[PDB]
Point group: C2
């Protein structure tokens, strides 16, 4: 069952990381000469349509290598990642990141996904010596993003709730996993304090969702971050007041997989990812529920997943990223 998915995910992500065109850059500069093709600006992450999608397509391959290598073109993936994760190319990425004219680049979606990639590489490095070299070569970029989080989070009086790549909860969820693995107590504290400051008074959520270009659910992603930030007992109480009518399938929009009118439009194509990431969030949250609601949410997750899984290769505007959310949804630890 996973066999078909892993083969498909492998093919997609391997094509993504090397595919140069089409591409979209979001690039600030104060020097007219600092306008170059992505291949030169981003020596590793130039493919997969944009920088952050290339990062998590690399993550998808690392995750497949760590946990699903029997289903995957293992040798091809290892050769591909080896030529990508070199010291010189990583120094090129760090050079772009550390240039003051590029301040704010990829905040926070690329930051969180990069820490998730670094985390997955370090976990693979527990058994694979090549991944220990990859982890060493990418350490400087990871340290850059950790520092940027520590510098920026204290400035955030307010969260960013929208279900696009600016979503605060998504990026901090991954940064928190990274922080706990690295035992970065200061990053962990910064994230926990920020989440509590922003979200602890949220209750009886309206959930005006989805919006036309969202690939994340504002209310679910926030709950998922808080499921890692709060103590279990505290989270269960918070969650019951947060969405108090879930057992009646309310708010109804969360139990209705979203419609996708045109997969050839880059923004509307995000809504396929919403059905996938809703499935992912529902599975995570199901582990904090009593048995009846647990199964209800997992059934809901499967209905959302099934509405999107068949379309992840319809268009490169989907296939350059949807595989990562499909695997995230599939791989949640069911407890």
């Amino acid at each position: 069952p996973m066999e078909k998915f892993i083969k498909q995910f492998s093919f997609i992500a391997l094509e993504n990381i090397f595919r140069e065109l089409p591409n979209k850059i979001t690039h600030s500069f104060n020097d007219i000469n600092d306008i170059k093709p992505p291949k030169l600006m981003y020596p590793i992450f130039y493919g997969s349509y944009d920088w952050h999608s290339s990062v998590h397509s690399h993550w998808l391959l690392v995750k497949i290598l760590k946990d699903f290598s029997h289903f995957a073109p293992k040798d091809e993936i290892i050769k591909a990642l080896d030529s990508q994760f070199s010291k010189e190319k990583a120094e090129g990425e760090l050079k772009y990141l550390q240039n003051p004219a590029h301040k704010g680049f990829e905040r926070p979606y690329g930051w969180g996904w990069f820490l998730k990639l670094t985390l997955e590489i370090n976990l693979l490095a527990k058994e694979n010596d090549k991944a220990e070299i990859w982890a060493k070569n990418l350490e400087g970029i990871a340290d850059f993003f950790v520092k940027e989080f520590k510098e920026f989070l204290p400035k955030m009086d307010y969260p960013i709730r929208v279900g696009t790549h600016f979503n605060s909860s998504f990026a901090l969820y991954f940064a928190l996993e990274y922080a706990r693995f690295k035992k970065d107590q200061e990053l962990e504290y910064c994230i926990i304090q920020s989440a509590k400051k922003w979200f602890l008074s949220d209750k009886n959520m309206q959930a005006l969702e989805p919006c036309g270009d969202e690939f994340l659910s504002p209310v679910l992603m926030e709950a998922v971050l808080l499921s890692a930030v709060l103590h279990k007992n505290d989270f269960v109480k918070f969650f019951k007041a947060y969405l108090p009518n879930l057992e009646a399938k309310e708010p109804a929009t969360l139990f209705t997989p979203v419609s996708v009118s045109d997969r050839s439009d880059g923004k509307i194509a995000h809504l396929d990812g919403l059905n996938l990431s809703r499935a992912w969030c529902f599975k995570i949250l199901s582990n904090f529920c009593d048995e009846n609601l647990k199964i209800l949410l997992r059934n809901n997750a499967t209905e959302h997943f099934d509405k999107a899984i068949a379309h992840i290769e319809d268009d490169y505007l989907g296939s350059h990223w949807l595989g990562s959310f499909a695997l995230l949804a599939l791989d949640v630890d069911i407890l």
Copy 2:
């Protein structure tokens, strides 16, 4: 009182529209040679930090020329606009827009602001012979955006609510003004039908605002669009059920000017614009209210405006755009 502001805004905008650096592009391409400095990609709108801010800095200058010329450096503005709005440069912008590899560029914020610019030029062309020529030279670009709107709105099953440049209500508010001036009945119908479909069931808004990078209020901007879409008596009934506790200043966030922790960060700097755009929206909405709520919202608007107006020149990350929102708020007809 307006005198200081108009001379200030003119001073700011004339520097903006010709200032090349720093700059930020959001640029998609399917040809590796299609990566050029903004001055070549956008022969008119290469300045003022980014394409859409350049467009509405041009609007600010046109608006000043039309309605505040006694306070303005008219000869300098006319000379600047004359060299900007040439047939050759407009054809260059249109060439970029019509390239299929650039599909979706600047949707919808740049679209609405360009139609607002075109509207103001066409109004100025009733009295100024040079604006007649500018309007002819920009007509192809306006026609392009009108066509892209008519093509895309039927695909939007869901609105975009976030208070950033993806905000549907902001862009459609300006596009609707343009449509009514041009007597484009189809564009008007598209907008009205979209707004009704997206928003008519919204009631008792939670208003989890602001978020950290917003320069628009989701709930207010939506009400402002509906104030132009619905008949007055329908809007009055809708608005009362929409924010039922406004007369008791609830939700409290709408009566609290937002905090701006760091004006040197491009995203946090948006929060200065939010205080200004809230003031603008409150003034518009006050004209639809009974005397009690009218007075409350107008006092609230003044406090929001006063919290931001002094900071609009603190940093280029603000001055490349804040003047336009200051003028919008100052220019609302109090009825």
